[PDB]
């Protein structure tokens, strides 16, 4: 704006109070040490805990949170003064310092759903995952114009001044002009907590300098800033002051005590807990239990290799729960998003939006460190087929447009299902081509179950009738609590246990000699990890590892 | 070659297969992402 007040006493009092806060003399000088760190490290944004501001003066914190603009400006001026007093030269180097807010906020810590209009002109915090994102452009904030004719200099804050007072030419002094970078991003509420009934709230976030590269599309970010309004269409925007990444990852104690392994074998019922109304395919249940669990990050130093990106494909005959099992995972989904068929929503596409060219992250990106449910895999087009092959291997999606080159994190897993177009039995011809998918994609997946309806009336009869009797005329939530605790477990391997896996692995190697053996060695890490994750044990049990060996044998039948 | 799209239909009729068959297979194998379908996508995009 540029409009100022002439010796405001309230502004002066705010400046004095914040300056007193900054000069922590009676305390150890924690913020003063932070000022030293920022001066040395060449960063010009000081993050101040709000809890300290409450402790020193609740009135200051209250007036800040209720009227963001003036208090923020005053506190910025206070920071400038304090820096100059400690070191004038560093202050002379830069134009204006910015201040960020972190800590704990009582009632202003909201969600995009919660962020109604009532929080206008108040500092807010928003939690979610980035959806749309735009490129880095420079935005002008102070343009310096010099007139060669009149020998005068004109400076303006923020059409562009092109003619002087008397239409003389104006050649701008670019160097004296200040340009700051700018970026437009968006956010959506978290998948698990936003109800699926009502419409989603999208909030626009504008980032100033030192914020363009701190958050990238697809991550999980907390944004704190001023919720202002631009001037027939009225749109809310959020000018941000601090961006921090997120994704680090009660009755639990009762759950923990109930889930002690010393009582009985919970794994027997645990596997059945996912397919309540499906008889048989118990091996499939174990694999599906495996897919949800398992680690998704390994400390692969000075490089990268196979990680928790392990996934399961399901191709089989219709009505064999191939379509149905996906819904069971989707219903009890820890951080999982559904997608099916073509799904032309830009897995990494921009759609080339004109009069604007934002980067709309797709389904696989929104599901970072989760599980993705995909129906009718063969329905996806070759355009996706080319992209989807690379995603699973390296773990990121490459966006290739004219000038826009960036990879989004895709630390993800896939649970894919596709109908065998017209294939009926898939027993005489090799599944490598009978499923249509001849591509090398098949090798990438860990598991490929074939759910044929072989005429087995003894086993088949029980599936038809007993499922109908499951109504029970005369524990869904449990797994939810389990998986959250299991996610923070890193079941380290034991060499004596590890050798036991190789010892029986030899017998399988000669069995399949007469399906890839070169990858099977790596997936043995996952399978052993899954069993210990069920027991929350830090070490793999040999008996548990034994069932891992059996699973590979059951894997190919 | 020589077994292009304009003559493959008549082969089914020669085998006493009416026009009903061509929809079930011929019109469905190209939608599968067959190389022959991709062959038309690149070579015949402007050449026709």
């Amino acid at each position: 704006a540029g409009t100022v007040v002439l010796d405001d006493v309230e502004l002066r009092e705010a400046q004095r109070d914040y300056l007193d806060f900054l000069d922590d003399e009676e305390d150890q000088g924690i913020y003063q040490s932070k000022v030293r760190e920022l001066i040395s490290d060449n960063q010009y944004r000081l993050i101040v805990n709000v809890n300290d501001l409450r402790r020193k003066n609740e009135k200051r914190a209250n007036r800040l949170l209720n009227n963001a603009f003036e208090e923020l400006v005053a506190f910025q001026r206070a920071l400038k003064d304090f820096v100059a007093s400690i070191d004038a030269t560093y202050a002379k180097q830069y134009e204006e310092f910015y201040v960020g807010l972190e800590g704990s906020f009582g009632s202003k810590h909201v969600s995009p759903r919660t962020l109604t209009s009532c929080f206008l002109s108040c500092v807010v915090c928003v939690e979610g995952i980035v959806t749309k994102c735009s490129l880095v452009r420079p935005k002008v904030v102070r343009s310096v114009h010099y007139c060669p004719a009149t020998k005068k200099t004109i400076e303006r804050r923020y059409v562009y001044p092109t003619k002087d007072e008397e239409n003389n030419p104006l050649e701008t002094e670019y160097g004296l002009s200040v340009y700051k970078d700018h970026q437009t991003i968006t956010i959506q509420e978290m998948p698990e907590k936003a109800p699926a009934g009502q419409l989603p709230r999208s909030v626009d976030v504008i980032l100033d300098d030192d914020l363009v590269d701190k958050a990238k599309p697809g991550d999980r970010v907390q944004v704190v800033g001023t919720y202002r309004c631009l001037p027939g269409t009225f749109r809310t925007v959020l000018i941000a002051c601090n961006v921090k990444q997120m994704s680090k990852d009660e009755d639990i104690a009762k759950i923990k005590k109930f889930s002690k392994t010393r009582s009985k074998d919970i794994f027997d019922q645990l596997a059945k807990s996912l397919a309540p109304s499906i008889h048989g395919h118990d091996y499939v249940k174990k694999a599906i239990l495996c897919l949800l669990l398992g680690g998704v990050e390994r400390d692969l130093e000075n490089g990268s290799h196979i990680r928790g990106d392990i996934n399961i494909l399901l191709i089989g005959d219709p009505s064999v729960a191939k379509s149905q099992l996906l819904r069971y995972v989707l219903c009890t989904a820890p951080r999982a998003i559904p997608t099916t068929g073509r799904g032309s929503s830009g897995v990494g596409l921009t759609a080339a939006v004109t009069t604007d060219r934002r980067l709309e992250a797709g389904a696989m990106v929104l599901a970072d460190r989760g599980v993705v449910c995909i129906d009718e895999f063969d329905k996806m087009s070759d355009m996706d087929r080319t992209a989807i092959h690379e995603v699973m291997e390296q773990g990121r999606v490459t966006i290739a447009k004219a000038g826009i080159h960036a990879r989004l994190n895709a630390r993800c897993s896939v649970l894919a299902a596709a109908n065998p177009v017209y294939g009926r039995y898939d027993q005489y011809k090799t599944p490598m081509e009978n499923i249509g998918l001849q591509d090398s994609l098949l090798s990438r997946f860990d598991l490929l179950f074939i759910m044929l309806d072989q005429m087995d009336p003894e086993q088949d009869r029980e599936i038809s009738d007993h499922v109908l009797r499951m109504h029970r005329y005369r524990s869904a939530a449990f797994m939810k609590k389990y998986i959250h605790v299991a996610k923070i477990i890193k079941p380290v391997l034991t060499q004596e246990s590890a050798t036991y896996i190789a010892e029986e692995y030899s017998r399988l190697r000669s069995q399949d000699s007469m399906p890839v053996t070169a990858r099977t060695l790596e997936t043995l890490i996952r399978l052993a990890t899954a069993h210990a994750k069920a027991r929350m044990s830090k070490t793999v049990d040999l008996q548990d590892a034994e069932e891992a060996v059996e699973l590979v044998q059951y894997a190919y039948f | 070659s020589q077994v292009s799209e304009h003559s493959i239909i008549k082969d089914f009729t020669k085998q006493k297969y009416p026009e009903h068959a061509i929809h079930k297979v011929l019109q469905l194998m190209l939608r599968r992402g067959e190389i022959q379908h991709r062959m038309q996508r690149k070579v015949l995009y402007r050449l026709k």
Partner: peptide, 20 residues
Amino acid sequence: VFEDNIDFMPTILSRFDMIF
């Protein structure tokens, strides 16, 4: 439409009834 009677949706038919 003018398993032998399937044009492009060999799944929708399973979801309906065979009604004349």
